[PDB]
């Protein structure tokens, strides 16, 4: 708590992803939880 | 070289540090805690910013024997420039309260780490004085008058506690006492005014005693004291001049303004009285109503 809105720009094939936040920075993040990269697709809004 | 030490501001860090340091060596019974003081020097205002102990011994059999470790002073310098380069050796604290002549010779030593004359900061740790928890003196070398030689001597130069801003925050935190002298309300300053008269009076009593011992017990005439006393007699208020008379007129001018203010409050205080009696007036009626209203309540239970 709290959870920041994100956006999924792309998936990197090693269980990672490139995401772009509503804050000016962008970030290299890990894919975690019950939501996988198979269950995600690029351009979808995601909880970080 | 400079003879500039006219004002000595003390951070409260220095007085509590000297209190600790005496007790971390455990000196007693006219053994002393001699350590360094750091700050800024070569300047009209000295700010005494910091204090540290040094290795030091004090012999009671001869006062010209003490120990001091020189290598300690050189090693402490290296370290303190890294923390803060605005800190440098400016002289030495001495536990006191008794100033001695052998202390002039310790003084010479400290004149080899600082360009200015070293400041010897007497900090009483025994807390015998109710005022002066700092007295400051600086060794200067001068031809003394009255056929007297060149003497090396410790002259008093003004000091006051003023605190740094960064220090302040903690001073506020640790003072949680009501403060008998703080300069507060009417009350606080009537306590002060009395305290102030007994302060001065005792200070005046030392002057009397001193003077007697010069011609009784043949103390050395120190003509500096005596010069100051000529001006004491020369700044005496003299009555019957138009100045004193204007001052008595001014006491009425001031009491005049006090009188108008006192009336103005008498109206506020009476305003408060009026306003309560209105409330009580209403309340008489509200309490009366309860008695009627019961009947109305009782009747319902019976019906329903």
């Amino acid at each position: 708590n709290p959870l920041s809105i994100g956006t999924l720009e792309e998936i990197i094939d090693d269980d990672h992803a490139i995401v772009t936040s509503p804050t000016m920075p962008d970030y290299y993040v890990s894919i975690l939880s019950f939501v996988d990269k198979e269950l995600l697709e690029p351009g979808c809004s995601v909880l970080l | 070289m400079s003879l500039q030490h006219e004002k000595v501001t003390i951070a409260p860090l220095v007085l509590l540090s000297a209190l600790d340091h005496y007790e971390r060596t455990q000196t007693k019974e006219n053994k002393r805690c001699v350590g360094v003081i750091l700050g800024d020097a070569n300047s009209s205002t000295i700010r005494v910013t910091n204090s540290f102990a040094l290795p030091f011994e004090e012999d009671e059999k001869n006062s010209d024997v003490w120990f001091l470790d020189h290598n300690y002073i050189e090693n402490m310098n290296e370290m303190c420039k890294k923390i803060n380069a605005k800190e440098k050796l400016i002289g030495w604290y001495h536990s006191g309260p008794k100033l001695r002549a052998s202390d002039l010779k310790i003084n010479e030593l400290f004149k080899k780490y600082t360009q200015n004359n070293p400041l010897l900061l007497i900090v009483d740790v025994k807390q015998q004085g109710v005022g002066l928890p700092t007295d400051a003196y600086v060794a200067i070398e001068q031809v003394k008058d009255d056929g007297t030689s060149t003497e090396k001597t410790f002259l008093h130069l003004p000091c006051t506690i003023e605190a740094e801003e960064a220090e302040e925050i903690g001073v506020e935190h640790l003072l949680r006492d009501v403060r008998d002298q703080a300069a507060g309300g009417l009350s606080i300053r009537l306590t002060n005014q009395l305290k102030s008269l007994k302060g001065l009076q005792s200070k005046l009593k030392d002057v009397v005693e001193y003077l007697d011992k010069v011609i009784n017990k043949e103390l050395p005439i120190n003509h500096t004291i005596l010069g100051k006393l000529q001006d004491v007699f020369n700044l005496l208020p003299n009555l019957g001049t138009p100045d004193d008379d204007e001052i008595d007129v001014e006491n009425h001018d001031r009491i005049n303004i006090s009188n108008n203010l006192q009336k103005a409050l008498t109206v506020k205080t009476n305003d408060e009285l009026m306003v309560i009696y209105i409330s009580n007036l209403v309340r008489s009626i509200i309490a009366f109503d309860d008695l009627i209203e019961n009947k109305i309540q009782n009747k319902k239970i019976q019906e329903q």
Binding site: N1, P2, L3, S4, I5, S21, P22, T23, L47 | -
Partner: protein, 51 residues
């Protein structure tokens, strides 16, 4: 007693930290709501004990 107590209670509110201000865009299914915090970005955040 009333007066001294109040002057201290308002000081206590200052010392404890700021607040912000959002508007609820939608309700989400963990008992949190999607807020758009008006001067910054969105934050998904838990209900109160009164709300």
């Amino acid at each position: 007693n009333d007066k001294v107590r109040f002057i201290k209670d308002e000081l206590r509110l200052l010392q404890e930290p700021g607040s912000y201000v959002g508007e609820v865009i939608k309700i989400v299914s963990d008992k949190k709501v999607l807020v758009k915090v008006q001067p910054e970005g969105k934050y998904i955040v838990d209900v109160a004990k009164d709300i």
